Structure formats: structure tokens, C-alpha cells
Amino acid sequence: VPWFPRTIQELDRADHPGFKDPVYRARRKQFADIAYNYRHGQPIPRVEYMEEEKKTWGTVFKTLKSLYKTHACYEYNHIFPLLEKYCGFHEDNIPQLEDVSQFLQTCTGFRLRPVAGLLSSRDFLGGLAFRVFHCTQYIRHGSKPMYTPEPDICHELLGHVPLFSDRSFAQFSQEIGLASLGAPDEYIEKLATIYWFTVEFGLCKQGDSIKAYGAGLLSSFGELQYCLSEKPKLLPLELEKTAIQNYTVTEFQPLYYVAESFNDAKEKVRNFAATIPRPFSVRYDPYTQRIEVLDNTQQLKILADSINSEIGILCSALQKIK
């Protein structure tokens, strides 16, 4: 059985544009080092971004800000003015992670964590189990401010973050994290694939119309308008046949699974999670910020107690709503 983090602190474990740039290069190595030195508990170090960078930020912050009220989903359009008014979300200044993290935490409890560059799906997903998002502090090269070969502070901030501010989305994400914990490769890859057609390139239901909630969609200008058109062949979010689906990395996907809601996708996920054959069950304890392995009979005595009291609340509340 694959190894997985039990504690939150246990997470401590040329075609590229700008490859010829000695500065940007050493700059991106500067950011990575920050990551390698970052240990949970301490505030995310702040950085003094450069204009050549701040320009690229505003070039994307302007190009996308127009298509959000249009193509972006509600939960996005709702939180944005709060992100702008609070975490310094403006085309003239790049938002500081410590702020966004500190912010997201009060919304859902999701904290940010600076990742060197990239990491396994098992590792990425594992962070979600603790409502921890591994974010990139760096930024794409100014050469092509409309394209990134991988996640940059724009994709993470103007794509992922706004969704992680939504109550229903967080639990949903966390589910996948709890699922991936100790899951066999085949399923790990399957979840990643789901994570794609959902978190990265997913489309939600807003009444009759369809909106874009995918992080890869929201941060990408060209696909934001493409996924909303009548060119791609939409399908229902069915985790069963969605995990099998093969996709391209460098280009647009003709398939975009339409989820009813995050609260709803959550259930097919839990299902896909129940599908995950694990020799046990795990539960996250937000108080001890530990991961509880449910295998013992006394381990269940306490989860039972947790629920028992919580419903007792749900009842008393309900009893008072005549």
C-alpha cells in the first residue's frame, strides 16, 4: 500500500519560453528555492515582483477579467470582487500568497503552500486531504503572456483559488484527497483524470445554461471562449466513464463533462471514492490536524460520537424551524 501523509506537517516531503533567459531562469530558481525552504506553520515569504512580470500579470488580468462575468461560473463572479477588494487582486499588483492563503483559510480553511514546480498526482491530491493547495509562486515568461506550458501564479490565482473559496468545492476537493490516500496507481491516475475534467477543465450547471469552473479554463483566454461555444461535444459528469477518457495535454479537449453542482459532483466523487478499493477508511480530524485510520473498533466509537453530536445539533435546529 502506497505511503500517504498522516499529519499536515508530513507534507514536508528548451521548448519552454524563457529557457534562453539567464535572468528569468535564475529568477524561477529563486522562487523554487523559497518552496524547498518552506516548512508548514510559518508564513509564506513575500516577494517583490518585477514590472516585466507585473506587466504580464496585468496582460492576463485584463484579457480574462472581461470574460468572467460572461463565461465564468457564479461562485467565481461572486468571490472575485472580494478577492479584488481584499487580497489585492488588481492588474497593477501581483497578489501575495500569504494574503490569499490567509484569506482562503477564513472562507473554507484551505491554506496555500508554495510548491517548487510540479509534483505527482498522488502528492498533489494528498495535499487536498488537508485542504492544502500546492501553489506556484513564479510566473510565465513575458515573451508569450497568453500561454504557459505549466501552472504559474496566474493559473493558480485566476483559476484555482476562486473555486477553493467556495464551501461546497472545498469538501469536494478534499474528498479526492482522502480518496487518493494510499490508493493504487491505476486509481490515482484515474482521479487525476477526473480532477482534470472537473477542477482543471470542468463545466458546471447554472440553471439551464453552462458556465466554466475549470481552473485551466478560467486562466486560459483561448479556451475560456471555446468551451462555452457549440463546437465541443458535451457529456454528463459520470466518473465511471470519465476516468477512462484519454485527453491531450498541449491542446483543447472536445470533451468537457458537465457537472450539475460541486455539491453534486461530490457525490459521484464519493461514489468513485467508494469505488477505490482500499483495505480501510480514513477520516480527517481538523482539531488535531491528523489523518485518522479507521481500522479499529474503538476508532469508530469516536467517529460515531462526532456524528451523534452533530446531528443532535441538526435536529435541535430543525426542531426550531416551524
Q: How far is the CB of 3 from a copy of itself (least distance, A)?
A: 20
Residue 200, annotated as binding a ligand: yes
Helices 97-107 + 74-86 axis angle, to 10 = 130
**Sign of the torsion formed by the C-alpha atoms of 62, 66, 69 and 71:** negative
Which lies closer to a copy of itself via its Cβ, residue 184 or residue 236? 236
Rule CB under 5 A: which residues touch Fe ion? 151, 215
Q: 131-150: which residues touch a copy of itself (CB under 8 A)?
A: 131
Q: Cα(67)–Cα(55) distance, rounded to whole angstroms?
A: 19
Pick the closest to residue 64 from 163, 188, 159 (CA basis). Answer: 159
Q: How far is the CB of 290 from a copy of itself (least distance, A)?
A: 8
Q: How far is the CB of 301 from a copy of itself (least distance, A)?
A: 5
> Is 102 among the residues that bind a copy of itself (CB under 8 A)?
no
> Is 206 among the residues that bind a copy of itself (CB under 8 A)?
no
Partner touching 90 among a copy of itself, Fe ion, none, CB below 5 to 8 Å by kind: none
Residue 40, annotated as binding a ligand: no
Q: How far is the CB of 197 from Fe ion (least distance, A)?
A: 13
Q: Where are the alpha helices (DSSP H) in the chain?
A: 22-37, 51-71, 74-86, 97-107, 121-128, 153-155, 167-180, 185-195, 215-218, 221-226, 239-242, 262-275, 297-319
> Is 250 among the residues that bind a copy of itself (CB under 8 A)?
no
Residue 71, annotated as binding a ligand: no
Q: Which residues are catalytic?
A: 155, 160, 200, 219
**Sign of the torsion formed by the C-alpha atoms of 172, 134, 105 and 90:** negative
> Is 306 among the residues that bind a copy of itself (CB under 8 A)?
yes
Pick the closest to residue 138 from 31, 253, 270, 46 (CA basis). Answer: 31
Question: Binding site membership for Fe cation: which residues?
Answer: 155, 160, 200
